[PDB]
């Protein structure tokens, strides 16, 4: 019966919590109470990229630490040369309601998606000398919140229909469908090994998926509101979540529970984006109070504040070499900080 | 900008910089309106001449040297709070209410309260359309305006009943810098884009006066 199956679910939930409490011998702050703090990180705006005339919702560094694509409500993707502050390309969009963008690791493609429920792939390197649409991926029911390239042929998309998908670009069909979330999926982070990825939805939960067989492995629940951002640790054995409850939390897969929470009494605004440094010691998070906060991932203490934006910081990104951090915001400008 | 190829890259960037200017300039003349309301409430038929350009439906029509862009969000059967900030820059909001749908009118009141008091739409004006006015007069003859509002102590006529519903919707407005506009049109008023045009023209004057510091 419905009641009979209800009791079994409660017992499984209680059993999981019993195992969770059994492996919590000491909190991470207890073991990390005897190493020197980072001090006070003071980064400065080294570049200011101008040319967008609306809110910026997404950006992504290329795998060379020099090229980055930015998406804005003006219906255009602009590829920047961050070194020279140059516009390599300007790609008009069929739909101006864009909320995500991705840069292919090979550098030959970019991704775009939003309220049109469609992920669009653009071929940057063409014999005709112009950027053209290579594929239009359809099948999602709700708005597309995030997309991340795996290779030139596979992409993973998160949508507002409580579902993530894996696509074959050449075929244009969903190879795998990921189901289990109760709320809208908002963020999506790919593991360095590409065999796993984690997503955070509006049900105040995060789920770890494997692209090989497409079944949820772990479910994390420590937040009180919508999860807006997620990103893997460089090790690939941990990830960080930013939420609307003005809190950041760090989860570990092998321990399978929360390790550290990042909050302050003076912060009452949700997190829009999260990112790690090259070594994972610094956790950079964008907030709704017009600022980006730098966190000590091992100390849960603020080490610096990035305050140069006149509107909400909606984007974050750390280069592959860790030299620069680029921050996009609703003020139509995005800056590079090092 | 020293080598020969570096100079040609800067010239390409300046050419792209130029084209961004006209595209933004050309988009400035556009008027963006957000259509809201309950399902099957005349939302898609507010203007007879509206022509479409399943997430978002964009409809465009130029009335008098003024391009209007209308966006309908009804296919996004999801959490509105995660994508409603994309329309924070709209000129006004067009809300449609069925005066005939008694059952759906309380849902309209709840929907109307949220949009007025949403943190993004605190200074965004709202044009209110009361549809099905012709059927409302025929409907009140059989079913009176007591089932929807038990607290209605007034005449059972048409004009008096219409004002009570309009007053309730305007009660949800609290900020004094929004200027809700009300209009009644059911199915046959062909001139229904003029009222939107007049309301938008009124809205821009108030915005200009505030920008000029006079208001």
């Amino acid at each position, epitope marked *: 019966e419905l009641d009979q199956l209800r009791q079994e679910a409660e017992q499984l939930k209680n059993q999981i919590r019993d195992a969770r409490k059994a492996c919590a011998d000491a909190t991470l702050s207890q073991i990390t109470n005897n190493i020197d703090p980072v001090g006070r990180i003071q980064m400065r705006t080294r570049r200011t990229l101008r040319g967008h005339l609306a809110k910026i919702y997404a950006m992504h560094w290329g795998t060379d630490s020099r090229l980055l694509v930015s998406a804005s409500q003006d219906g255009k993707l602009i590829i920047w040369d961050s070194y020279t502050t140059n516009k390599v390309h300007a790609i008009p969009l069929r739909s101006s309601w864009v909320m995500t963008c991705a840069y292919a690791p090979s550098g030959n493609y970019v991704a775009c998606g939003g309220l049109d429920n469609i992920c669009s792939i653009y071929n940057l390197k063409t014999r005709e000398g112009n950027v053209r649409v290579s594929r239009e991926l359809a099948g999602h029911t709700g708005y597309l919140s995030c997309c991340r390239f795996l290779d030139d042929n596979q992409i993973v998309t998160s949508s507002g229909d409580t579902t993530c998908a894996l696509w074959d670009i050449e075929t244009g069909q969903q190879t795998t469908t990921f189901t289990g979330h109760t709320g809208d999926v908002m963020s999506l982070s790919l593991a360095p090994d590409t065999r796993l990825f984690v997503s955070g939805a509006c049900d105040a939960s995060a789920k770890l998926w494997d692209v090989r067989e497409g079944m949820c492995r772990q479910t994390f629940t420590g937040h009180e509101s919508d999860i807006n951002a997620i990103c893997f640790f460089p090790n690939g054995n941990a990830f960080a979540t930013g939420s609307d409850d003005a809190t950041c939390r760090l989860f570990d897969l092998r321990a399978d529970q929360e390790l550290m929470t990042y909050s302050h009494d003076n912060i009452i605004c949700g997190i829009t984006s999260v990112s790690f440094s090259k070594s994972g010691r610094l956790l950079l998070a964008g907030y709704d109070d017009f600022n980006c906060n730098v966190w000590d991932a091992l100390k849960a203490d603020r080490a610096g504040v990035l305050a140069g934006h006149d509107n909400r910081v909606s984007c974050l990104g750390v280069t592959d070499d860790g030299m620069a951090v680029a921050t996009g915001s609703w003020d139509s400008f995005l800056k590079i900080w090092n | 900008t020293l080598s020969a*190829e570096d100079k040609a890259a800067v010239e390409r960037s300046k*050419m792209i910089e130029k084209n961004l200017k006209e595209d933004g300039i050309s988009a400035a003349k556009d008027v963006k309106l957000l259509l809201l309301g309950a399902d099957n409430s005349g939302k898609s038929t507010i203007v007879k001449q509206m022509k479409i350009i399943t997430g978002i439906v964009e409809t465009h029509f130029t009335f008098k040297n003024l391009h209007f862009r209308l966006f309908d969000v009804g296919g996004q059967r999801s959490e509105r709070k995660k994508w409603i900030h994309c329309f924070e820059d709209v000129t006004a909001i067009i809300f449609c209410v069925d005066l005939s749908d008694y059952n759906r009118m309380h849902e309209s009141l709840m929907l109307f309260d949220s949009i007025c008091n949403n943190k993004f739409f605190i200074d965004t004006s709202i044009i209110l359309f009361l549809n099905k006015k012709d059927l409302f007069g025929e409907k009140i003859k059989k079913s009176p305006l007591t089932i929807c509002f038990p607290e209605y102590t007034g005449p059972n006529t048409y004009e008096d009943a219409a004002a009570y519903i309009q007053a309730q919707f305007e009660s949800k407005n609290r900020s004094p810098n929004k200027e809700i506009y009300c209009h009644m049109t059911c199915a046959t008023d062909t001139n229904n884009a003029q009222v939107i045009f007049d309301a938008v023209t009124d809205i821009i004057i108030a915005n200009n006066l505030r920008g000029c510091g006079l208001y």
Partner: single-chain antibody
Amino acid sequence: VQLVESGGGLVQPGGSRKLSCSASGFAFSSFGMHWVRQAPEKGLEWVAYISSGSGTIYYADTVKGRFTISRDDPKNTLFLQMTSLRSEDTAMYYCVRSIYYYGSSPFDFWGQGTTLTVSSDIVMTQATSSVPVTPGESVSISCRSSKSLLHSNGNTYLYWFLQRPGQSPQLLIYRMSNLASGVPDRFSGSGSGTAFTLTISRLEAEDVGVYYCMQHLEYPLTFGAGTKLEL
């Protein structure tokens, strides 16, 4: 992608002639355009350059004041107005497309030009002229430069072109080390400042011809004498 040249023929000395090239298959509004000569028994020679948007225009020292370069983007055509023709202007004129951004491949496409009968600068040196090779051996082609082509931005500007008999030259390597689209991976280029080489591993047919080294560090653009491989 197709560039077709028109004009040329028997022109008496002191006359005028207009050469036109029609572009089809690509976007003729984002590509810089070039003119390159080739004397009947000599190497390539740069003539003129017009940028996208007709902003920057350059000429060689031997054609300045006599040659004019212009384009009409809506008509997808490039022009070269030549006045006061001399006996030294008798050559085959090639139209070359070129795009310029981060990671571009300039001088990617050439068009089969039209012959014409009329009857400091960086010095590029290719001492080797004729080299006999076998179908399967590995050969190296060397080029020399008077100046150091390495720039302060880490980009050194050397170009390698192959001109098979009865064909227009095609790009093999751009910027001393970069392979062009459609070029087999056996071609490889390497070198340093004022010293360059091009390696062709596992030489076979269709690799015979004249190889030219060209510098894009600054205008005017200078070519080499040409290294000819013979089977």
